[PDB]
Design a protein around this ligand. Structure first.
Ligand SMILES: *[C@@H]1O[C@H](CO)[C@@H](O[C@@H]2O[C@H](CO)[C@@H](O)[C@H](O)[C@H]2NC(C)=O)[C@H](O)[C@H]1NC(C)=O
Ligand SMILES: *[C@@H]1O[C@H](CO)[C@@H](O[C@@H]2O[C@H](CO)[C@@H](O)[C@H](O)[C@H]2NC(C)=O)[C@H](O)[C@H]1NC(C)=O
Ligand SMILES: *[C@@H]1O[C@H](CO)[C@@H](O)[C@H](O)[C@H]1NC(C)=O
Ligand SMILES: *[C@@H]1O[C@H](CO)[C@@H](O)[C@H](O)[C@H]1NC(C)=O
Ligand SMILES: *[C@@H]1O[C@H](CO)[C@@H](O)[C@H](O)[C@H]1NC(C)=O
Ligand SMILES: *[C@@H]1O[C@H](CO)[C@@H](O)[C@H](O)[C@H]1NC(C)=O
Ligand SMILES: *[C@@H]1O[C@H](CO)[C@@H](O)[C@H](O)[C@H]1NC(C)=O
Ligand SMILES: *[C@@H]1O[C@H](CO)[C@@H](O)[C@H](O)[C@H]1NC(C)=O
Ligand SMILES: *[C@@H]1O[C@H](CO)[C@@H](O)[C@H](O)[C@H]1NC(C)=O
Ligand SMILES: *[C@@H]1O[C@H](CO)[C@@H](O)[C@H](O)[C@H]1NC(C)=O
Ligand SMILES: *[C@@H]1O[C@H](CO)[C@@H](O)[C@H](O)[C@H]1NC(C)=O
Ligand SMILES: *[C@@H]1O[C@H](CO)[C@@H](O)[C@H](O)[C@H]1NC(C)=O
Ligand SMILES: *[C@@H]1O[C@H](CO)[C@@H](O)[C@H](O)[C@H]1NC(C)=O
Lengths: 197, 99, 249, 87, 50, 50, 49
């Protein structure tokens, strides 16, 4: 990344690189220059290929073999069991897209751009544009069905009760706030300010 | 495959050794700790009790496993050998990858 | 409702009531931590931003192809029509038309493929909504890591965000266990839970939470003599009826 | 142009866009804002529960396609039409 | 599904009547009116469109 | 160029099939290996053990 | 003789109050049969003599 540093490394794919004309390290995915090979292993930062990944040490670029994870051996015995004595609850976030932008394109203005003779020459090619417009309309119409089938699974609009006696649980960060004009929740508001075109 | 005339192939990120290590780790976890390691930290437990739990989930009482442990073990051992023999008989069950 | 949902994951409903405050505090801290983690960007929203970028880049690539030449003398149609006679302009108009039509066809095909991908993702999202939000899932890793309790949906500019609440065991201790207890020549098995020992005495405890009980005829059942079971131990069992019968004197 | 704007709200008949839909009054075309559904508030309390006392069984229908018509087109015959020189 | 297969098939059939810049959309007329060494340049432009 | 474009389109079509198969394989791994599926015919015929 | 067995494995037990529950009289249930049930408390009650 430019904001981190300016040092770069160059990879030549699929070349023995004895003929490629510092540090030169041979790799099964082709040798790379500007990197130092090390003994240690870490999680993959930048995938190179064939189990080799590169990362920034912090002031130099290094290449290493990937590490799958920490190794541990469970104490198996034929008369021993392990039982938990305490618990912790946790919250995780999962994100899924549901729809995309609806667009429509006309041939005549795109190809011909209001020219009359171009339109006369275009009509002898048949009905390509009827097919194209039908396909684009079919793409556009099914976008609304995707949003319709994910949400709107509840028939009636339930409202939150005025008193928040929920046994000590605090849902204020996810319940909607009537004061802010778009009537969204705090987290939902925080989400919309993070995505830009 | 072969490479020539402006087209090349690229090696995958994970080698076969790493995939084999992942499968071995999964197998060791599922034979030494049951389903516990999938939710959190692995908890060791003998295998006969785990077979008893799995029997109890399908609506069969756990007492019938202990009274028939040898028979079930023998049947499992015979089934594994039969599966090993079947693939060695050059049966074309691997068509999906070859296609 | 929390008491119901703990019963679904194989944990007795009582343990909620002695730990309600701790559970509520943990839930509030987890919500605050999710808020702080969402504030600190780590490319979590990349699954929407990449879709927006691939749509915009494809559209923009379609735009720049209008300036291509395709073998004509100039790409500006007005120059062609105002510079050459029609019978010689036609042999340029046709090739320009073919190039533009091919570009449009390629764009339409790419949009057709991307629409199917997005629709598959939307079907998965609807299935996950119906599964995790309106009920309590039993299939593992479908509504987050661990034993699923509930979920909450949130809106996104082109998607949906799920907040999964799960139950995770924290710290464990190990004990000596036995499959059955033999008393009076008869084998005993637990109705639920397993037999555990701290080295001197035997107890019955829950599946996923340490809570010992005295071995009693109430939570055990008998099936046959005990010589056949492998690894059986030799301990007594208590019956509550005998002290009551003795007190009837 | 040609639709009357009204205060009311109903389920969408013909989608227009941005929450606007059109329908036939039975005898003019009207335009209205979509109604998401009926509104009610549940009587929540910290010591109140509701238990059903009766039940009704129902049958629903769902339809799914499994296949489509098998077709085949001969490339040479379609393009050329049994033409030696064209072939 | 039935309609969207039928319309695609019908549109495929109808495309055979297009001209594609040739002097005639019927190939028999092309090879019955013209001498082949200048008729191939008429046949190819139908071939590409089809 | 037309040949290359046809090849690219065919690869793009096949990639979706490969991805769908991979997603099904991952779901089956998670449900049948890391737990005991209560769901019929998803992890083999009969009642699933492990 | 009548017994109680599991869903998927034959293992007949003696019908006992411990593995059965009572609800309503037997006039409404269609197909009910006429058989006795065992109560384990009576021998223990007799033991106090
Ligand atoms: C189980 O874990 C909880 C937290 O996960 C423990 O509760 C904390 O205990 C420490 C010990 O003094 C206190 O300082 C904290 O205030 C407690 N609460 C929190 C939210 O951290 C608890 O002690 C553990 N053990 C048992 C038996 O519950
Ligand atoms: C529970 O519902 C059933 C039907 O949903 C009720 O049965 C009906 O009761 C009315 C009362 O006069 C009769 O006219 C109908 O003939 C009954 N049958 C049907 C099919 O409608 C029943 O009364 C309700 N209550 C109880 C306690 O069962
Ligand atoms: C650049 O890196 C620094 C140090 O990691 C960081 O504080 C900063 O936010 C990054 N971005 C910019 C725009 O400076
Ligand atoms: C690169 O070329 C040299 C000289 O031909 C050869 O000795 C060497 O083995 C080659 N590298 C590899 C990885 O084969
Ligand atoms: C990595 O360790 C091996 C011994 O296992 C050694 O021979 C090699 O020199 C080490 N690599 C570096 C860069 O020091
Ligand atoms: C819920 O949390 C917010 C933010 O910390 C706080 O302002 C509010 O008072 C809390 N609700 C209750 C009932 O304590
Ligand atoms: C319990 O676990 C520890 C940690 O692996 C192990 O050393 C010990 O042998 C186990 N058993 C007992 C009885 O402590
Ligand atoms: C085991 O638990 C019992 C419970 O009363 C206790 O009396 C005994 O001392 C414990 N033994 C050990 C070794 O902790
Ligand atoms: C396994 O169990 C048997 C009895 O079932 C016991 O004799 C043996 O010592 C156990 N194995 C170990 C390593 O203790
Ligand atoms: C179990 O205890 C009984 C009590 O009399 C004894 O007869 C039997 O031999 C014991 N069995 C074992 C394996 O210790
Ligand atoms: C809807 O009602 C408001 C007053 O509540 C009124 O001002 C407005 O004109 C009405 N809309 C139409 C289309 O008449
Ligand atoms: C069905 O059961 C009834 C009693 O519930 C009995 O009278 C009748 O004979 C049975 N049907 C047949 C075909 O035996
Ligand atoms: C069942 O047995 C009781 C016992 O006397 C008798 O009164 C009753 O009539 C019997 N019913 C049938 C259907 O045999």
């Amino acid at each position: 990344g430019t904001n981190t540093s300016n040092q770069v490394a160059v990879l030549y794919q699929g070349v023995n690189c004895t003929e490629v004309p510092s540090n030169v390290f041979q790799t099964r995915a082709g040798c790379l220059i500007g990197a130092e090979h090390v003994n240690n292993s870490y999680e993959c930062d930048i995938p190179i290929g064939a189990g080799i990944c590169a990362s920034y040490q912090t002031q130099s670029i290094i290449a290493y073999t990937m590490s799958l994870g920490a190794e541990n051996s469970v104490a198996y015995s034929n008369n021993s069991i392990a039982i938990p004595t305490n618990f912790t609850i946790s919250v995780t976030t999962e994100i899924l897209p549901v729809s995309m932008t609806k667009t429509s394109v006309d041939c005549t203005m795109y190809i011909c751009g209001d020219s009359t003779e171009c339109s006369n020459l275009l009509l002898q090619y048949g009905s390509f544009c009827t097919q194209l417009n039908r396909a684009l309309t079919g793409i556009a119409v099914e976008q609304d069905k995707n949003t319709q089938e994910v949400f709107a699974q509840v028939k009636q609009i339930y409202k939150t009760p005025p008193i928040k006696d929920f046994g000590g649980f605090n849902f204020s960060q996810i319940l909607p706030d009537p004061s802010k004009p778009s009537k969204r929740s705090f987290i939902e508001d925080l989400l919309f300010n993070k995505v830009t075109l | 495959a072969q490479k020539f005339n402006g087209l090349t192939v690229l090696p995958p990120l994970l080698t076969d050794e790493m995939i084999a290590q992942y499968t071995s780790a999964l197998l060791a976890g599922t034979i030494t700790s049951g389903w516990t390691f999938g939710a959190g930290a692995a908890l060791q437990i003998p295998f006969a009790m785990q077979m008893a739990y799995r029997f109890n989930g399908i609506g069969v009482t756990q007492n019938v496993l202990y009274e028939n442990q040898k028979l079930i073990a023998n049947q499992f051992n015979s089934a594994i050998g039969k599966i090993q023999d079947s693939l060695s008989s050059t049966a074309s069950a691997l068509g999906k990858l070859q296609d | 409702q929390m008491a119901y949902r703990f019963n679904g994951i194989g944990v007795t409903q009582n343990v909620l009531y002695e730990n309600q405050k701790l559970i509520a505090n943990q839930f509030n801290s987890a919500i605050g931590k999710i808020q702080d983690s969402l504030s600190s960007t780590a490319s979590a929203l990349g699954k929407l931003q990449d879709v927006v970028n691939q749509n915009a880049q494809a559209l923009n690539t379609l735009v720049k192809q209008l300036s291509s030449n395709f073998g004509a003398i100039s790409s500006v149609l007005n120059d062609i029509l105002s510079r050459l006679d029609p019978p010689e302009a036609e042999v340029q108009i046709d090739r320009l038309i073919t190039g533009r039509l091919q570009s449009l066809q390629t764009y339409v095909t790419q949009q057709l493929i991307r629409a199917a991908e997005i629709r598959a993702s939307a079907n998965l999202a609807a299935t996950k909504m119906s599964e995790c939000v309106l009920g309590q899932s039993k299939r593992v890793d479908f509504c987050g890591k661990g034993y699923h309790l509930m979920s909450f949906p949130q809106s996104a500019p082109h998607g949906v965000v799920f907040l999964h609440v799960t139950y995770v065991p924290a710290q464990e201790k190990n004990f000596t266990t036995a499959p059955a207890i033999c008393h009076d020549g008869k084998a005993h098995f637990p109705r639920e839970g397993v037999f555990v020992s701290n080295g001197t005495h035997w107890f019955v405890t829950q599946r996923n939470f340490y809570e010992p009980q005295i071995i009693t005829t109430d939570n055990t059942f008998v099936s046959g003599n005990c010589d056949v079971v492998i690894g059986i131990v030799n301990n007594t069992v208590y019956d509550p009826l005998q002290p009551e019968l003795d007190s009837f004197k």
